[PDB]
Amino acid sequence: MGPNPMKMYPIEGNKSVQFIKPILEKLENVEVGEYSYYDSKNGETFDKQILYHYPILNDKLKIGKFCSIGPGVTIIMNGANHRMDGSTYPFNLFGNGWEKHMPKLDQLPIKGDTIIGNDVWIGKDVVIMPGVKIGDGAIVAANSVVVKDIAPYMLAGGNPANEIKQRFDQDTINQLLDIKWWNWPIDIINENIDKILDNSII
Amino acid sequence: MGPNPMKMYPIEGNKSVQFIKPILEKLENVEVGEYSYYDSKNGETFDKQILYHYPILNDKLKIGKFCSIGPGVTIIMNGANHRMDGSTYPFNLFGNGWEKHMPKLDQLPIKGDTIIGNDVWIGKDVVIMPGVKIGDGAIVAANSVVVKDIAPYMLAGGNPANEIKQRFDQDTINQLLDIKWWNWPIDIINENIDKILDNSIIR
Amino acid sequence: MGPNPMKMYPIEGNKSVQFIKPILEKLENVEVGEYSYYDSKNGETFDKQILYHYPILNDKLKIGKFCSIGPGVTIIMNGANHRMDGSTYPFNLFGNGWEKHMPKLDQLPIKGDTIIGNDVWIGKDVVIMPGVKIGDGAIVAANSVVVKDIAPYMLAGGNPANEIKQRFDQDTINQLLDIKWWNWPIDIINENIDKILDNSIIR
Ligand SMILES: CC(=O)SCCNC(=O)CCNC(=O)[C@H](O)C(C)(C)COP(=O)(O)OP(=O)(O)OC[C@H]1O[C@@H](n2cnc3c(N)ncnc32)[C@H](O)[C@@H]1OP(=O)(O)O
Ligand SMILES: CC(=O)SCCNC(=O)CCNC(=O)[C@H](O)C(C)(C)COP(=O)(O)OP(=O)(O)OC[C@H]1O[C@@H](n2cnc3c(N)ncnc32)[C@H](O)[C@@H]1OP(=O)(O)O
Ligand SMILES: CC(=O)SCCNC(=O)CCNC(=O)[C@H](O)C(C)(C)COP(=O)(O)OP(=O)(O)OC[C@H]1O[C@@H](n2cnc3c(N)ncnc32)[C@H](O)[C@@H]1OP(=O)(O)O
């Protein structure tokens, strides 16, 4: 069974639901997993939703397999930060002599790579701040502002967002992360969705 | 006296203030009381602020009376929630094979109906999540994400929105919760506005 | 040596970067320092980011110097508060003989001035709420909602905004606060930016 993961619009008609991989599959230092979708807030494509993400800074966007991303979700790659070891005022923007004062790489922020795992639900209007890695099978509550790391199968929410609670007994998770179905052959999953939906495949 | 509640756009030569009841009149499972208004962020009418509200899912929106509801406020209904007993992936909606996995009415969640009381003031750009109950006299602060019931005449606010203080002492609240001035006929409310604005009405 | 403050678009052919001072220069009750700038979202100008600022309510808005304000920042002046001694319903909006219950000034809230400092970097989509002061050097994390004051050279984030950590150790700050580089002859400033950027202006 199934829909095609390489169609930008895998639902005849619906032009809001997008599998992100293909779209982002042009982008550098963006690696995406099949079947993970974005749902458009205004019809914009997800690519426009990555911001301050410049190849020359070498930070990476990893998004896993079978992820649900909702409208308004913006991911904030490193480019955003003002230098902060001194004045944070970007003298070099305005030229006329000041142009000589650009930050030499190293004195730029580096907060790391940004990792979204598999089977991750990110609510609507969510903001992932630079650096953070989000755990396999995690849920991020709507209008959240993720600045910390989110453990697998944790419920995180807030601004700043906090680990509200595990979604399962720590043993189910441990198993779940052990079995790692999102990786299974497509042929296999199509015959295990309900056991994957009902959390039985364990 | 005053404007007629049934007027969608009550203020003269103006399209930004709205009585809601008339506007959400064509919206199943939504009860809305008289005189509550929306202030359009940009001319969107308030019906577009009711998000993820599906019939089948049998959850209801009840807004009360004399509420002020500021621009960008959004009311999310139970249609927003994925299935969380396992993978919150929606295989179904993609279909072409997966449609057989559509969730069953009772397999999904439903966190409740949404209830906003009377004379409650919701701030700019506030986000109301499913199943939250705000009591009469309450006030939610701008840019707040409400995921909890708010009790009568609480000031709440924040993300996640919490209760901060009580607008008034508790003789007043308990008294204000008694008399229920909003339930009065408007031609009786009229003669008591000024005293409803300084809470001495209770006497 | 440098850009021209008197210019609202200091970079030829870019209408996005904006010097704030010349823009609000005629806005009432709005003081703005030189060089402080705004980065435009979808083409807006910063004046349009100061909300409910009613000359009649007598509240002001000070912005210090060499500030960076991020896209979508919003400064919410007292005009966006309801009356609260009693009902928040603005009976007085909808006329038709309800004008009489207009609030006399002193019945409204007056959170008072809003003060942003020198050398302050306000995040994208931050919400400054009426009556806040923000210290020199301070920094306000994105989609924050500031509701209390922030001390100089602090970091702050969230919703509510709260102080996270001191940007530098106290004594470093105390130096920075004394020497107040943002007041120097721009010709001096022009000769010590490197030192201004690596904090090594206190050695
Ligand atoms: C296709 C679609 O329709 S999806 C489109 C749009 N999708 C969405 O916006 C979905 C948004 N859903 C959410 O973000 C919700 O917050 C959910 C689903 C994650 C909440 O899941 P729930 O597991 O039911 O748990 P829950 O609502 O019980 O609350 C648990 C606690 O977390 C807290 N909490 C809930 N939301 C948040 C939040 N956003 N931030 C911080 N804390 C929160 C509550 O206060 C609650 O308190 P308590 O634990 O003692 O009772
Ligand atoms: C004309 C028009 O259409 S106006 C339309 C738009 N209107 C609006 O957006 C209304 C927004 N108004 C507000 O949010 C106001 O600030 C109000 C209603 C919250 C005022 O609340 P207040 O009753 O004045 O009291 P107050 O401001 O003193 O603050 C008290 C405490 O609440 C806290 N607080 C304020 N806002 C929040 C919030 N959003 N989340 C958490 N805590 C908060 C403060 O930190 C403070 O701390 P403390 O208790 O020790 O001092
Ligand atoms: C070019 C342009 O115009 S883009 C302009 C707009 N750009 C932006 O919006 C930049 C936004 N920058 C931020 O908000 C960043 O989070 C910063 C710079 C404020 C934080 O800097 P950092 O100092 O590196 O601290 P980090 O290590 O990231 O933060 C320190 C702590 O504060 C916490 N924190 C971060 N954000 C928040 C928040 N919003 N609320 C509460 N706590 C927070 C972190 O979790 C961290 O926790 P920890 O104490 O154990 O480490």
In terms of C-beta density within 10 A (0-12 exposed, 13-18 middle, 19 or more buried), how is residue A58 classed? exposed
Q: Resolution of this entry in Å? A: 3.0
Which residue in the set A119, A142, A198 is minimally distant from B85, CB to CB?
A198
Q: What distance in Å separates the CA atoms of residue C189 and residue C65, rounded to the nearest whole number?
A: 12
Query: Rounded to whole angstroms, how far apart are CA atoms C109 and C195?
Result: 44
Q: Which amino acid belongs to residue C68?
A: S
**Which residue segment(s) compose the domain that A80 sits in?**
2-202
What is the distance between the alpha carbons of residues B177 and B174, in angstroms, rounded to a whole number?
Answer: 5
Neighbours of A108 (CB within 10 A): 15
d(CA A92, CA A159): 32
- B84-96: string of b/e by CB count within 10 Å (b at 16+)? eebbbbbbbbbbe
Q: Which residue, C35, C25, C38, C31, is CA-closest to C69?
A: C38
Residue B63 phi/psi, 5-degree rounding, is -110, 145
Burial class (CB in 10 A: 0-12, 13-18, 19+), C131: buried
Structure tokens at B119: 């004379």
Mutate to test the pocket of ligand 3, among A53, A74, A81 (most ligand atoms within 8 A of CB): A81
- Determine which one of B15, B82, B180, B195 is catalytic: B82
Say yes or no for a CB contact (<8 Å) between B145 and A145.
no
Task: Let me know if B29 is exposed, middle or buried by CB neighbors in 10 A (0-12, 13-18, 19+).
Answer: middle
Token readout for B95 is 């279909």
Backbone angles phi, psi at B162, to 5 degrees: -120, 165
**CB of C154 closer than 8 Å to CB of C133:** no
A-B interface: how many C-beta pairs under 8 angstroms?
79
Cβ–Cβ contact C80 with B under 8 A: yes
Spatial separation of the C-alpha atoms in residues B45 and A143, rounded to whole Å: 22
Give strand pairing partners of C114. Answer: C61
| Total tally of structural domains belonging to chain A | 1
Q: Return d(Cα C177, Cα A170) in angstroms, integer.
A: 50
Output the CA B39–ligand 3 centroid distance in Å: 33
User: How far separated are the first and last CA of chain B, in Å rounded?
Assistant: 23
Whole-angstrom Cα distance, residue A159 to residue C157?
8
Question: C115 with C128: CB under 8 angstroms?
Answer: no
- Element containing residue B187 per DSSP (H, E): helix B186-189
Give bridge partners of residue C122 from the DSSP assignment.
C69, C140
Q: For residue C157, what is the enclosing H or E element?
A: strand C154-158
Contact of B139 with B155, CB cutoff 8 Å: yes
CATH number of the structural domain spanning residue C153: 2.160.10.10
- Tell me which residue in A86, A98, A107 faces C3 most closely, judged by beta carbons: A98
Among C94, C27, C100, CA closest to C62? C27
Residues 6+ apart with CB under 8 A from B171: none
Cα–Cα distances in angstroms (integers) from residue C115 to residues C10, C61, C200, in the given order:
24, 6, 27
How far is the C-alpha of C68 from the C-alpha of A177, rounded, in Å?
Answer: 44
List the structure tokens of A163.
């680990």
Cα B194 to Cα C81: distance, rounded to the nearest angstrom: 18
CB-CB contact of C34 with C21 (8 Å): yes
In B, minimum Cα distance to C101 occurs at: B194
Q: What are phi and psi of C8, to 5 degrees?
A: -80, -25
- Residues of chain C in contact with residue B12, where contact means CB-CB under 8 angstroms, are 95
Cα angle: A38, vertex A44, A47; to 5 degrees: 65
Q: Is B110 near chain A, with CB under 8 Å?
A: no
Strands (E) across chain A are located at: 17-19, 30-32, 37-39, 50-51, 61-63, 68-69, 74-76, 114-116, 121-122, 127-128, 133-134, 139-140, 145-146, 154-158, 161-166
- In 3-state terms, what secondary structure has residue B144? coil
Q: B115 forms bridges with which residues in the sheet?
A: B62, B133
The residue whose CA has the least distance to atom 51 of ligand 2 is C148
